[PDB]
């Protein structure tokens, strides 16, 4: 999912950490 | 506003040496370690060498901008931003940052920094060659700030990040907040305890 | 315009911290790893130490100048330019840049940077002493930009690398493939892009 | 005064090249090593590799501010501050600072800096595998200042460091002593100080 | 106690070193 | 003019990031490796670790000054000067510069920079334990400039390096040859140059 | 004048990139190695790893100040001063400076800098395990300056310095200044050769 | 050819990459 | 004596190196 | 000779390399 792609992670606060 | 304007604004306005507390509330920092590899383990010396992504987020409302006719995020070098002074208390090497030192800043002032870090730790390595495995504990917190200036929270409990090519496999990762209050001192001290339960593959 | 003028103009316009997107189109970055050497391989720890040229090109139209009666290229230190924030997601060491950190800038605003890099990766190393060889996979992408800000475009998707690879290495390259991969996650509207580099190599007989 | 003001004022007032002596009195510096780990020991070469927190404190009254309607302390990067030129005379490696390089400054002008440091020393390692253990002595002092410019004092003379030392080390700490030595030489009127830290430790059985 | 937490230490001169 | 004046004038005139071509002639650069030591050699991995002085000279006429009643040379930090972007194409480590980074600038605008460098190379190491020895080839050239911007030339060409090489090395130098190569490719009008250094050496008996 | 004034004046006056020659006389530099430890020795590769204090002194008359009713010395970061471009010609590693990079400047303009340095040398290591010992020679000089710009001299003077805990002991230290004038070239070229005779202890 | 000489490579976008 | 203490050394040119 | 002393070398272009 999003959170294990570094760019997706930091682009998506509400979804990831 | 184009990206150039926003970045210019941020560089002029951001104070890297000034914790961005708003009305004496702490800066809420979220921190979560994503383990990528375990490179070397020594059961005699109780040391491990690991690579992890340190997903870290917080808010600096002074960075905010109106994003209706503008980009709502930009990438910004961390040297232009205040970053929390997080450290692992049981680290025995400097954190080697492997990746470009850029954070993501959202137009509401949220900052996301996720460096890939290689670092060595002193921790319980016993049982690494058994089925139950070893459980290595890493404590992360602010080096100089108490909980009324910086609060640290996890994000609780592998497979999606960890290299399938490591000699080791991850059984479980647990990330928990500890808050301690000492009799001497009215304020609380926080850290995030990461428990990395792992073993040598068959 | 002489070289000094062009360099002055580039220093006045170029913002190293500002991705040169035009009208919210991504910056198309072309990337091709040319393997020069495989220095150390460990089949027990699954780690490899490699040297490669990272041929990287992109366009920053703000750098452009009229090149009738002027030089049509100059060499420019990368500290004066925006460079893409590329990283290998399975690297276990910092990329050590071995070479002078100068890019070539063409008068139409194309930038070409080809550093020689030494770096260690966690990789499938099994079969390195067999005929089929080992196949070591490296995933490269932008560390912070999604596909509406940066596109990554592998060039030379299939090659034996015979033109680059040291004849003196104890290894030989069987094949290098470099392939584009893009994922869209249900949570998030934008796509995430990377180049998967497969380095198929073996110990020489 | 807000935090931004205080930090600005400290950066402007603290001069890393200017010892903050007041009326030609020495700057009183406290130093106290808290041992965290002993990583490697060599009884043949008499070398140890250790990790310790180096608690260092001193006062610069010119940094003081009125804290009634302001924070009473702030965290300040040490690059903005004068720090004492302390060194371990028997170190055989650079001190590797593991932690963020921030000191705490209190509104009365006290500065507290406690970096975690990894460093190698040449010292007596004999008896490390016995019950009495080895006693490794580390001498710390100012590299360029005598005692009328910087005074160095130990803090606590005696500790087991049970609260700091890793339970996972191969070694255990029996005792830590931190004592001031002052020497006056026949040639020279002023006194020379150091803190001798005696780390009595042994291999766990 | 306080003194073995790095932040508590430097926040409490009267308690620690 | 004293040395301070000369250095001030050089800082005013020199652009470190601008190649000092005069009327679109190349900058003529001379390069010559003087071997000081061979530290480690691996016949299995074909790697050598060497220390050499990299004697490099070129001209920047804009630095010139009138030297009647003035010093006719000064030592100048290279960070104030343009330096050629030379690299060894078969290097597998960063060049570690061991010496103070000062060049000599002569009043006619000649610049001489001779850093002592430690570096590892991939090269032919076979025969190192024989009488004929191994012959390790190092190719040096500009990383980004073709021959109409920078020309690279050897000086000596043939030498045993007896004046430079450590008598304490495990190895001895039989011969060092330094030759220019110029290639023109069908695609592209300009020529590409390098200096090939052939280091013929063997393990001492 | 207080210390702040002196330091301000030095920062205004000092030219770190300009040799402080007075009336076209050389800058007389004194250099003396005080050996503290010998850490690693390899008799096969002829390499030694040594720790020494590099006592270095010279004069920069432009730094001078009137010291009646003022301090007559201050400590100054070397990055604010010219320092001689000394190098060991047979070093095979960068000098690792272990200590704070502060010199002492006296009011008459004398500068004294004594860093602790760790460095590796290519040296005659044969006989290190014998009674006569090995004799390792380290040659120090200016990298770019001839003797009319910088003169390098030993110091008008072992084992008040050397670690009693080293596995080696120092038998003898000899210091030889060499000055050579060639027919080709008008100036003279100098170095100081320090010969360190040492052996493995019984 | 051109593309395996680093300078020729970056000097010739239309030929290399 | 003085000369083997680094600070005493550099504080005392007339005594030490 | 001159050329094996680093300073003499760079001081004497016409003599050395």
CSV table of N, CA and C in Angstrom, one decimal, chain C residues 56-181:
chain,number,residue,atom,x,y,z
C,56,UNK,N,21.7,10.6,-16.2
C,56,UNK,CA,20.4,11.2,-15.8
C,56,UNK,C,20.2,12.5,-16.7
C,57,UNK,N,19.1,12.6,-17.3
C,57,UNK,CA,18.8,13.8,-18.1
C,57,UNK,C,17.4,14.3,-17.8
C,58,UNK,N,17.2,15.6,-17.9
C,58,UNK,CA,15.9,16.3,-17.8
C,58,UNK,C,16.1,17.6,-18.4
C,59,UNK,N,15.0,18.4,-18.3
C,59,UNK,CA,14.9,19.7,-19.0
C,59,UNK,C,14.5,20.7,-17.9
C,60,UNK,N,15.1,21.9,-17.9
C,60,UNK,CA,14.8,23.0,-17.2
C,60,UNK,C,14.8,24.2,-18.1
C,61,UNK,N,13.6,24.5,-18.7
C,61,UNK,CA,13.4,25.5,-19.8
C,61,UNK,C,13.9,26.9,-19.3
C,62,UNK,N,13.9,27.2,-18.0
C,62,UNK,CA,14.3,28.4,-17.5
C,62,UNK,C,15.8,28.7,-17.7
C,63,UNK,N,16.6,27.6,-18.0
C,63,UNK,CA,18.1,27.7,-18.2
C,63,UNK,C,18.4,28.1,-19.7
C,64,UNK,N,17.4,28.0,-20.6
C,64,UNK,CA,17.6,28.1,-22.0
C,64,UNK,C,18.2,29.5,-22.4
C,65,UNK,N,19.0,29.5,-23.4
C,65,UNK,CA,19.5,30.8,-24.0
C,65,UNK,C,19.6,30.6,-25.5
C,66,UNK,N,19.7,31.7,-26.2
C,66,UNK,CA,19.8,31.7,-27.6
C,66,UNK,C,21.3,31.4,-28.0
C,67,UNK,N,21.5,30.3,-28.7
C,67,UNK,CA,22.8,29.8,-29.0
C,67,UNK,C,23.4,30.0,-30.5
C,68,UNK,N,22.7,30.8,-31.3
C,68,UNK,CA,23.3,31.3,-32.5
C,68,UNK,C,24.3,32.3,-31.9
C,69,UNK,N,25.5,32.3,-32.5
C,69,UNK,CA,26.6,33.2,-32.1
C,69,UNK,C,27.0,33.1,-30.6
C,70,UNK,N,26.6,31.9,-30.0
C,70,UNK,CA,27.1,31.6,-28.6
C,70,UNK,C,27.4,30.1,-28.5
C,71,UNK,N,28.1,29.7,-27.5
C,71,UNK,CA,28.3,28.3,-27.2
C,71,UNK,C,26.9,27.6,-26.9
C,72,UNK,N,26.7,26.4,-27.4
C,72,UNK,CA,25.4,25.7,-27.2
C,72,UNK,C,25.3,24.8,-26.0
C,73,UNK,N,26.5,24.7,-25.3
C,73,UNK,CA,26.5,24.0,-24.0
C,73,UNK,C,27.5,24.6,-23.1
C,74,UNK,N,27.4,24.3,-21.8
C,74,UNK,CA,28.4,24.6,-20.8
C,74,UNK,C,28.3,23.5,-19.7
C,75,UNK,N,29.4,23.4,-19.0
C,75,UNK,CA,29.5,22.5,-17.8
C,75,UNK,C,29.2,23.4,-16.6
C,76,UNK,N,28.3,22.9,-15.7
C,76,UNK,CA,27.8,23.7,-14.6
C,76,UNK,C,27.9,22.8,-13.4
C,77,UNK,N,28.4,23.3,-12.2
C,77,UNK,CA,28.4,22.5,-11.0
C,77,UNK,C,27.0,22.2,-10.6
C,78,UNK,N,26.7,21.0,-10.2
C,78,UNK,CA,25.3,20.6,-9.8
C,78,UNK,C,24.8,21.4,-8.6
C,79,UNK,N,25.6,22.0,-7.8
C,79,UNK,CA,25.2,22.8,-6.7
C,79,UNK,C,24.5,24.1,-7.2
C,80,UNK,N,24.7,24.5,-8.4
C,80,UNK,CA,23.9,25.6,-9.0
C,80,UNK,C,22.6,25.2,-9.7
C,81,UNK,N,22.3,23.8,-9.7
C,81,UNK,CA,21.2,23.3,-10.4
C,81,UNK,C,20.3,22.5,-9.5
C,82,UNK,N,19.0,22.5,-9.9
C,82,UNK,CA,18.1,21.5,-9.3
C,82,UNK,C,18.5,20.1,-9.9
C,83,UNK,N,18.6,19.1,-9.1
C,83,UNK,CA,18.8,17.7,-9.6
C,83,UNK,C,17.7,16.9,-9.0
C,84,UNK,N,17.2,15.8,-9.6
C,84,UNK,CA,16.2,15.0,-9.1
C,84,UNK,C,16.7,14.2,-7.8
C,85,UNK,N,15.8,14.0,-6.9
C,85,UNK,CA,16.0,13.4,-5.6
C,85,UNK,C,15.9,11.9,-5.7
C,86,UNK,N,16.7,11.3,-6.6
C,86,UNK,CA,16.6,9.8,-6.9
C,86,UNK,C,17.3,9.0,-5.8
C,87,UNK,N,16.8,7.9,-5.4
C,87,UNK,CA,17.3,7.0,-4.4
C,87,UNK,C,17.0,5.6,-4.7
C,88,UNK,N,17.8,4.7,-4.3
C,88,UNK,CA,17.6,3.3,-4.4
C,88,UNK,C,17.0,2.8,-3.1
C,89,UNK,N,15.8,2.3,-3.2
C,89,UNK,CA,14.9,1.9,-2.0
C,89,UNK,C,15.6,0.7,-1.3
C,90,UNK,N,16.4,-0.1,-1.9
C,90,UNK,CA,17.1,-1.3,-1.3
C,90,UNK,C,18.6,-1.1,-1.1
C,91,UNK,N,19.0,0.2,-1.1
C,91,UNK,CA,20.4,0.5,-0.9
C,91,UNK,C,20.7,0.4,0.6
C,92,UNK,N,21.9,-0.2,1.0
C,92,UNK,CA,22.3,-0.3,2.3
C,92,UNK,C,23.5,0.6,2.6
C,93,UNK,N,23.9,1.4,1.7
C,93,UNK,CA,25.0,2.4,1.9
C,93,UNK,C,24.6,3.7,1.2
C,94,UNK,N,25.2,4.8,1.6
C,94,UNK,CA,25.1,6.1,0.9
C,94,UNK,C,25.7,5.9,-0.4
C,95,UNK,N,25.2,6.5,-1.5
C,95,UNK,CA,25.9,6.5,-2.8
C,95,UNK,C,27.2,7.4,-2.7
C,96,UNK,N,28.3,6.8,-2.9
C,96,UNK,CA,29.6,7.5,-2.9
C,96,UNK,C,29.8,8.0,-4.3
C,97,UNK,N,29.7,9.3,-4.6
C,97,UNK,CA,30.0,9.9,-5.9
C,97,UNK,C,31.5,10.0,-6.1
C,98,UNK,N,32.0,9.4,-7.1
C,98,UNK,CA,33.5,9.3,-7.3
C,98,UNK,C,34.1,10.4,-8.2
C,99,UNK,N,33.2,11.1,-8.9
C,99,UNK,CA,33.6,12.0,-10.0
C,99,UNK,C,33.3,13.4,-9.7
C,100,UNK,N,33.9,14.4,-10.6
C,100,UNK,CA,33.5,15.8,-10.4
C,100,UNK,C,32.0,16.1,-10.7
C,101,UNK,N,31.5,16.9,-9.8
C,101,UNK,CA,30.0,17.0,-9.7
C,101,UNK,C,29.6,18.2,-10.6
C,102,UNK,N,29.8,17.9,-11.9
C,102,UNK,CA,29.4,18.9,-13.0
C,102,UNK,C,28.5,18.2,-13.9
C,103,UNK,N,27.4,19.0,-14.2
C,103,UNK,CA,26.5,18.6,-15.3
C,103,UNK,C,26.8,19.4,-16.5
C,104,UNK,N,26.3,18.9,-17.6
C,104,UNK,CA,26.3,19.6,-18.9
C,104,UNK,C,24.9,20.2,-19.1
C,105,UNK,N,24.8,21.5,-19.5
C,105,UNK,CA,23.6,22.2,-19.8
C,105,UNK,C,23.6,22.6,-21.2
C,106,UNK,N,22.6,22.2,-22.0
C,106,UNK,CA,22.4,22.5,-23.3
C,106,UNK,C,21.6,23.8,-23.4
C,107,UNK,N,21.8,24.6,-24.5
C,107,UNK,CA,21.1,25.9,-24.7
C,107,UNK,C,19.6,25.8,-24.7
C,108,UNK,N,19.0,24.6,-25.1
C,108,UNK,CA,17.6,24.4,-25.0
C,108,UNK,C,17.1,24.1,-23.6
C,109,UNK,N,18.0,24.0,-22.6
C,109,UNK,CA,17.6,23.8,-21.3
C,109,UNK,C,17.7,22.4,-20.8
C,110,UNK,N,18.2,21.5,-21.7
C,110,UNK,CA,18.5,20.1,-21.3
C,110,UNK,C,19.7,20.1,-20.3
C,111,UNK,N,19.5,19.3,-19.3
C,111,UNK,CA,20.6,19.0,-18.3
C,111,UNK,C,21.0,17.6,-18.4
C,112,UNK,N,22.3,17.3,-18.4
C,112,UNK,CA,22.8,15.9,-18.5
C,112,UNK,C,23.9,15.8,-17.4
C,113,UNK,N,23.6,14.9,-16.4
C,113,UNK,CA,24.5,14.6,-15.3
C,113,UNK,C,24.7,13.1,-15.3
C,114,UNK,N,26.0,12.7,-15.3
C,114,UNK,CA,26.4,11.3,-15.3
C,114,UNK,C,27.5,11.1,-14.3
C,115,UNK,N,27.1,11.0,-13.0
C,115,UNK,CA,28.1,10.7,-11.9
C,115,UNK,C,28.5,9.2,-11.9
C,116,UNK,N,29.7,8.9,-11.6
C,116,UNK,CA,30.1,7.6,-11.3
C,116,UNK,C,29.8,7.4,-9.8
C,117,UNK,N,29.1,6.3,-9.4
C,117,UNK,CA,28.6,6.1,-8.1
C,117,UNK,C,29.0,4.7,-7.7
C,118,UNK,N,29.5,4.6,-6.5
C,118,UNK,CA,29.8,3.3,-5.8
C,118,UNK,C,28.7,3.2,-4.6
C,119,UNK,N,28.1,2.0,-4.6
C,119,UNK,CA,27.1,1.8,-3.6
C,119,UNK,C,26.8,0.3,-3.3
C,120,UNK,N,26.4,0.0,-2.1
C,120,UNK,CA,26.1,-1.4,-1.7
C,120,UNK,C,24.6,-1.6,-1.7
C,121,UNK,N,24.2,-2.8,-2.1
C,121,UNK,CA,22.7,-3.2,-2.2
C,121,UNK,C,22.5,-4.5,-1.5
C,122,UNK,N,21.3,-4.7,-1.0
C,122,UNK,CA,20.8,-5.9,-0.5
C,122,UNK,C,20.1,-6.5,-1.7
C,123,UNK,N,20.5,-7.7,-2.1
C,123,UNK,CA,20.2,-8.3,-3.4
C,123,UNK,C,20.2,-9.8,-3.3
C,124,UNK,N,19.4,-10.4,-4.2
C,124,UNK,CA,19.5,-11.9,-4.4
C,124,UNK,C,20.9,-12.2,-5.1
C,125,UNK,N,21.8,-12.8,-4.4
C,125,UNK,CA,23.1,-13.1,-4.8
C,125,UNK,C,23.3,-14.6,-5.1
C,126,UNK,N,22.2,-15.4,-4.9
C,126,UNK,CA,22.3,-16.8,-5.0
C,126,UNK,C,22.5,-17.1,-6.5
C,127,UNK,N,23.3,-18.2,-6.8
C,127,UNK,CA,23.6,-18.6,-8.1
C,127,UNK,C,24.7,-17.9,-8.8
C,128,UNK,N,25.4,-17.0,-8.1
C,128,UNK,CA,26.5,-16.2,-8.7
C,128,UNK,C,27.6,-17.1,-9.3
C,129,UNK,N,27.8,-18.2,-8.7
C,129,UNK,CA,28.9,-19.2,-9.2
C,129,UNK,C,28.3,-20.2,-10.2
C,130,UNK,N,27.1,-20.0,-10.7
C,130,UNK,CA,26.5,-20.9,-11.7
C,130,UNK,C,26.5,-20.2,-13.0
C,131,UNK,N,26.1,-21.0,-14.1
C,131,UNK,CA,26.0,-20.5,-15.4
C,131,UNK,C,24.9,-19.5,-15.6
C,132,UNK,N,23.7,-19.7,-15.0
C,132,UNK,CA,22.6,-18.8,-15.1
C,132,UNK,C,22.9,-17.5,-14.3
C,133,UNK,N,23.7,-17.6,-13.3
C,133,UNK,CA,24.2,-16.4,-12.5
C,133,UNK,C,23.2,-16.0,-11.5
C,134,UNK,N,23.6,-14.9,-10.8
C,134,UNK,CA,22.7,-14.2,-9.8
C,134,UNK,C,22.0,-13.1,-10.5
C,135,UNK,N,20.8,-12.7,-10.0
C,135,UNK,CA,20.1,-11.6,-10.5
C,135,UNK,C,19.8,-10.6,-9.4
C,136,UNK,N,20.5,-9.5,-9.3
C,136,UNK,CA,20.4,-8.5,-8.3
C,136,UNK,C,19.5,-7.4,-8.7
C,137,UNK,N,18.4,-7.1,-8.0
C,137,UNK,CA,17.3,-6.2,-8.3
C,137,UNK,C,17.5,-4.9,-7.5
C,138,UNK,N,17.5,-3.7,-8.2
C,138,UNK,CA,17.6,-2.4,-7.6
C,138,UNK,C,16.5,-1.6,-8.0
C,139,UNK,N,15.7,-1.0,-7.0
C,139,UNK,CA,14.5,-0.2,-7.3
C,139,UNK,C,15.0,1.3,-7.0
C,140,UNK,N,14.9,2.1,-8.1
C,140,UNK,CA,15.2,3.5,-8.0
C,140,UNK,C,14.0,4.4,-8.3
C,141,UNK,N,13.9,5.5,-7.5
C,141,UNK,CA,12.8,6.5,-7.7
C,141,UNK,C,13.1,7.8,-7.0
C,142,UNK,N,12.2,8.7,-7.2
C,142,UNK,CA,12.3,10.0,-6.4
C,142,UNK,C,11.9,9.7,-5.0
C,143,UNK,N,12.6,10.2,-4.1
C,143,UNK,CA,12.4,10.0,-2.7
C,143,UNK,C,11.1,10.8,-2.2
C,144,UNK,N,10.8,11.9,-2.7
C,144,UNK,CA,9.7,12.8,-2.3
C,144,UNK,C,8.6,13.2,-3.3
C,145,UNK,N,8.9,13.0,-4.6
C,145,UNK,CA,8.0,13.4,-5.6
C,145,UNK,C,7.2,12.3,-6.2
C,146,UNK,N,5.9,12.4,-6.3
C,146,UNK,CA,5.0,11.5,-7.0
C,146,UNK,C,5.1,11.8,-8.6
C,147,UNK,N,4.3,11.0,-9.3
C,147,UNK,CA,4.4,11.0,-10.8
C,147,UNK,C,3.8,12.2,-11.5
C,148,UNK,N,3.1,13.1,-10.8
C,148,UNK,CA,2.6,14.4,-11.4
C,148,UNK,C,3.7,15.4,-11.2
C,149,UNK,N,4.8,15.1,-10.4
C,149,UNK,CA,5.9,16.1,-10.2
C,149,UNK,C,7.2,15.6,-10.9
C,150,UNK,N,7.5,14.3,-10.8
C,150,UNK,CA,8.6,13.6,-11.5
C,150,UNK,C,8.1,12.3,-12.2
C,151,UNK,N,8.5,12.2,-13.5
C,151,UNK,CA,8.4,10.9,-14.2
C,151,UNK,C,9.8,10.4,-14.4
C,152,UNK,N,9.9,9.1,-14.2
C,152,UNK,CA,11.2,8.4,-14.4
C,152,UNK,C,11.1,7.5,-15.6
C,153,UNK,N,12.0,7.6,-16.5
C,153,UNK,CA,11.9,7.0,-17.8
C,153,UNK,C,13.2,6.3,-18.0
C,154,UNK,N,13.2,5.0,-17.9
C,154,UNK,CA,14.4,4.2,-18.1
C,154,UNK,C,14.7,4.2,-19.6
C,155,UNK,N,16.0,4.4,-19.9
C,155,UNK,CA,16.5,4.3,-21.3
C,155,UNK,C,17.4,3.1,-21.3
C,156,UNK,N,17.7,2.5,-22.4
C,156,UNK,CA,18.5,1.3,-22.5
C,156,UNK,C,17.9,0.2,-21.5
C,157,UNK,N,16.6,-0.2,-21.8
C,157,UNK,CA,15.9,-1.2,-21.0
C,157,UNK,C,16.5,-2.6,-21.1
C,158,UNK,N,17.2,-3.0,-22.1
C,158,UNK,CA,17.9,-4.2,-22.3
C,158,UNK,C,19.3,-4.1,-22.9
C,159,UNK,N,20.3,-4.6,-22.2
C,159,UNK,CA,21.7,-4.5,-22.6
C,159,UNK,C,22.6,-5.5,-21.9
C,160,UNK,N,23.6,-6.0,-22.6
C,160,UNK,CA,24.7,-6.8,-21.9
C,160,UNK,C,25.8,-5.9,-21.3
C,161,UNK,N,25.7,-4.5,-21.5
C,161,UNK,CA,26.6,-3.6,-20.9
C,161,UNK,C,28.0,-3.8,-21.3
C,162,UNK,N,28.3,-4.4,-22.4
C,162,UNK,CA,29.6,-4.8,-22.9
C,162,UNK,C,30.5,-3.6,-23.1
C,163,UNK,N,29.9,-2.4,-23.4
C,163,UNK,CA,30.6,-1.2,-23.7
C,163,UNK,C,31.1,-0.5,-22.5
C,164,UNK,N,30.6,-0.8,-21.3
C,164,UNK,CA,30.9,-0.1,-20.0
C,164,UNK,C,31.7,-0.9,-19.0
C,165,UNK,N,31.3,-2.2,-18.9
C,165,UNK,CA,31.8,-3.0,-17.8
C,165,UNK,C,33.2,-3.4,-17.9
C,166,UNK,N,33.9,-3.3,-16.8
C,166,UNK,CA,35.4,-3.5,-16.7
C,166,UNK,C,35.7,-5.0,-17.1
C,167,UNK,N,36.6,-5.1,-18.1
C,167,UNK,CA,37.0,-6.5,-18.4
C,167,UNK,C,37.9,-7.1,-17.3
C,168,UNK,N,38.2,-6.3,-16.3
C,168,UNK,CA,39.1,-6.8,-15.2
C,168,UNK,C,38.3,-7.3,-14.0
C,169,UNK,N,37.0,-7.1,-13.9
C,169,UNK,CA,36.2,-7.6,-12.8
C,169,UNK,C,36.3,-9.1,-12.8
C,170,UNK,N,36.1,-9.7,-11.7
C,170,UNK,CA,36.1,-11.2,-11.5
C,170,UNK,C,34.7,-11.7,-12.0
C,171,UNK,N,33.8,-10.7,-12.1
C,171,UNK,CA,32.4,-11.1,-12.6
C,171,UNK,C,32.3,-10.6,-14.1
C,172,UNK,N,31.3,-11.3,-14.7
C,172,UNK,CA,30.8,-10.8,-16.0
C,172,UNK,C,29.3,-10.6,-16.0
C,173,UNK,N,28.8,-9.6,-16.7
C,173,UNK,CA,27.5,-9.3,-16.9
C,173,UNK,C,26.8,-10.1,-18.0
C,174,UNK,N,25.7,-10.8,-17.6
C,174,UNK,CA,24.9,-11.5,-18.6
C,174,UNK,C,23.9,-10.6,-19.2
C,175,UNK,N,23.2,-9.8,-18.4
C,175,UNK,CA,22.1,-9.0,-18.8
C,175,UNK,C,21.8,-7.9,-17.8
C,176,UNK,N,21.4,-6.7,-18.3
C,176,UNK,CA,20.9,-5.7,-17.4
C,176,UNK,C,19.6,-5.2,-18.0
C,177,UNK,N,18.5,-5.3,-17.2
C,177,UNK,CA,17.2,-4.8,-17.7
C,177,UNK,C,16.8,-3.6,-16.7
C,178,UNK,N,16.2,-2.6,-17.3
C,178,UNK,CA,15.8,-1.4,-16.6
C,178,UNK,C,14.4,-1.1,-17.0
C,179,UNK,N,13.4,-1.2,-16.1
C,179,UNK,CA,12.0,-1.2,-16.5
C,179,UNK,C,11.2,-0.3,-15.6
C,180,UNK,N,10.3,0.4,-16.2
C,180,UNK,CA,9.4,1.4,-15.5
C,180,UNK,C,8.3,0.6,-14.8
C,181,UNK,N,8.0,1.0,-13.5
C,181,UNK,CA,6.9,0.5,-12.8
C,181,UNK,C,6.2,1.6,-12.1
